[PDB]
Symmetry: C5
Subunit: 207 residues, 5 copies
């Protein structure tokens, strides 16, 4: 028998927040998916947008696993007691603002899920935002210090209303949201850094 | 039998701020209620409001209980010493700005109460704010990671004037406030998250 | 003869920043007095105002007293090492911006003083600020979690220059200040919470 | 011999950040000098200024001294590991914004230097900023909780250009800066607090 | 056996984040380079600019070195677990805002690399921003408390592209960027402080004639 006080106590005795949980030599698989909740500010001249989205993140950590046959197989743990992917938005022009409790969910099998709601300003193409076709703002999010051999980032291609949780009170509306995978190399070093290109096709409303 | 100093020592020895106090296997019953204090900024064009309010939060944590027959049955404790529910306004567009000292009240029977004054910005229906019927802006508050099996949220029952604490110097006024309970499920997972929907009907003040 | 180091060390070893220094079962008599130093942002439309003031607070904790016949009878101690009254401005719409070092003064007889300079925004009656009688903004401050039986606030009694330290460069001027005591209760609970109501009667200085 | 690691380690073990290094009974001698870097915002209507300046502070703490014959005679230390004068700008309307690494310099003789670049807003005379005479904003800096007997402040006795490190891109320019020594006293208590009055005579650079 | 955990563990036991890694007794060589990403607000009247850039910093700390013949030769460590140059922009009017996770890259040969994306506001010459030649904003970055005998800062002047990483959606375009090493002394004290003068020449896009 075991409770939540133990599941956490154990996570503390095993988790290494500062050490990436690289199973064997295989890189840590990190899935990234953004759920656009709102579009607060847009500047058709400076090409900047202020958005609110849930940055759904999922990865795995073996050392945190535990037998949940007689205890819960999931618990909410502060991200501070857990290693977290140093994901970053390459084209963000403001520090990320986390609007929610910074708590992740850990499953008895090492599965970890973190989904904070974030408000952030980005630098992207805002042209055509006031037309029927709308504009497309691409946001590149991927690890900042871990390359392909250490961390890998893949989106979540599937069926889902790109504006399922989008505020109906926004002055904008979402037309389409596609998230593809890609890599980023630099004119210095050979190693590339996997990322996810989230393409946001939105437009201003007009009755 | 003891003093406030002792009471505090035991709490810090038994309390587990990072572990939900799920008595048995049932969810923790958290009550939420919002006492609107002020309505500062409104924008019918962007549908954003800036509101000040007290977030009456109450729940139970039996592990904190102590003998109060001959000792104080109530003490003030830093929330950082107690487990606190991970509530979040769903339509909030700014993190909550706590205006008051982050102190909770704990009773001998383990009942906990925390009522901080908060100033937050929400995204909601502001249309009609300058009309006689006013606008109805709805705010949804509930746990962020704990579903219905772990935390249950319900509004506090207490029929009183909605603008009983509402500043008479605000540019707007409260026509009515109704706090209902609801559940939000996400297309992926069968877990439902309980929340409270506080609908604030307010308008701009006029004259004649 | 004890030095300032031995004095602090003794304070640190006996003071409990999270435990109210209650003697017996009598409330801790806290003194609150505001010294308005400046008045900046003002809006008669939104009924808000930016104000800078010294929140001269004082109370006692006899457990910290020491013999100063041949030693310093006062030291500057970091408020984080001491228990400080959890006071808040009920009608404030921004958290207090403490401009000065967060240091208190502990006196050999257990007396404690804390006088931080603060800039904060308030929602009060700003109407008439541009008239001869000016405007009258009232600020309510008091304990946020401790009720009358645990804490009691009483404004310092002494006729002082209401603008003794007020900035001459401010676009405004103070007509008069009245610090009256007051009590507040809620339609939920019996216990009351004492507070101080400071009435700042100020007006905009006329160039003619 | 002893490398930097040893010196820095020794300081961290003997530093008493909350106790004033008062040699004997004579107060701690603190020297302050403001080296203006820029004038960003100025409002003659509200008498406010936003400026950037290097607040050079100098004092001694013999306890930190060491033998630097065959070792480093100066090391950089975080001001958090050391005691620091609780200086305040009596007429500031915003808390100081330290823009530079909060590191100090500790010389082997126990001399401590702390020169942080700060941006802060003040409430002073701006009238004339647009004339050939220019405006004369006066800034009072001094200890906030230590009086003459515990802490003394004196401007660095020197004669250097008042615009040496002033930005050439600023819309304004400095006519002259005088750093006079002064003191303050409050109607209640006999103690006096030593300060420094920095008078900044500046004006807007005309279109020529 | 030595995985990432150990590499980090030992780094925490032999690393003093507040003690500058002065090998022998010579000064620490810090290489500073800026990679401009975007130019936001620009006020020609007040002469101020909001810029975004990656501050590529590189130096060596031997107390961190380790054998990498049969183990990882690189890891990511929080900058708080190690020593970092106290660089500062002398003409900054706002504290640096770090947008990206604050982690450094540590190689087994003691080599340390820190490249944070920073958003900072500066006071410089903005005149001519809306002209063909454009404006030239100079940003001075160097150590704040370590003089030339303790820290030497030299830019990594390598034949690269200046607007290589600059956002294409910015209202401005980079005409040229030059990073010249320099020193700053004061009419009070003998010590000289090394720095890097980064001159950014830019102008508004889409002008006429
Ligand atoms: O499954 N979901 O879509 N969940 C979800 N969307 C918004 C909030 N939320 C609950 C949740 C679930 C797990 C974690 Cl780590 N955080 C939050
Ligand atoms: O409405 N109330 O019941 N109480 C209340 N409103 C403002 C201050 N206050 C007292 C109080 C009591 C307990 C706690 Cl944890 N916080 C606040
Ligand atoms: O009015 N006073 O008596 N004192 C006073 N006003 C502003 C600063 N000051 C000195 C002081 C005295 C005591 C404490 Cl705890 N802090 C500061
Ligand atoms: O003497 N100075 O003017 N020094 C100086 N001006 C700008 C930077 N700098 C170096 C310095 C040296 C020592 C300390 Cl504690 N702080 C800063
Ligand atoms: O330009 N680069 O060489 N590298 C680079 N640009 C953006 C991210 N990145 C990789 C990186 C590598 C090492 C560190 Cl400490 N930070 C970042």
């Amino acid at each position: 028998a075991a409770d939540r006080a133990d599941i956490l106590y154990n996570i503390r005795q095993t988790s290494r927040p500062d050490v990436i949980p690289t199973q064997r030599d295989r890189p840590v698989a990190v899935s990234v998916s953004l759920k656009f909740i709102n579009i607060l500010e847009v500047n058709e001249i400076t090409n900047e947008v202020d958005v609110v989205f849930w940055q759904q993140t999922t990865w795995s950590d073996r050392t945190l696993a535990w037998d949940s046959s007689h205890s819960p197989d999931q618990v909410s743990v502060p991200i501070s007691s857990l290693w977290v992917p140093d994901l970053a938005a390459y084209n963000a022009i403001s520090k990320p603002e986390v609007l929610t409790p910074q708590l992740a969910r850990v499953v008895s099998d090492g599965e970890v899920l973190y989904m904070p709601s974030i408000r952030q300003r980005f630098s992207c193409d805002v042209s055509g935002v006031d037309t029927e076709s709308g504009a497309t703002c691409r946001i590149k999010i991927g690890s900042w210090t871990h390359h392909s051999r250490e961390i890998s980032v893949d989106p979540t291609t599937e069926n889902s209303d790109d504006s399922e949780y989008f505020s109906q009170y926004s002055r904008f509306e979402i037309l389409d949201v596609t998230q593809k995978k890609n890599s980023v190399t630099y004119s210095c070093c050979p190693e590339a850094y996997e990322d996810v290109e989230v393409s946001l096709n939105f437009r201003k409303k007009g009755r």
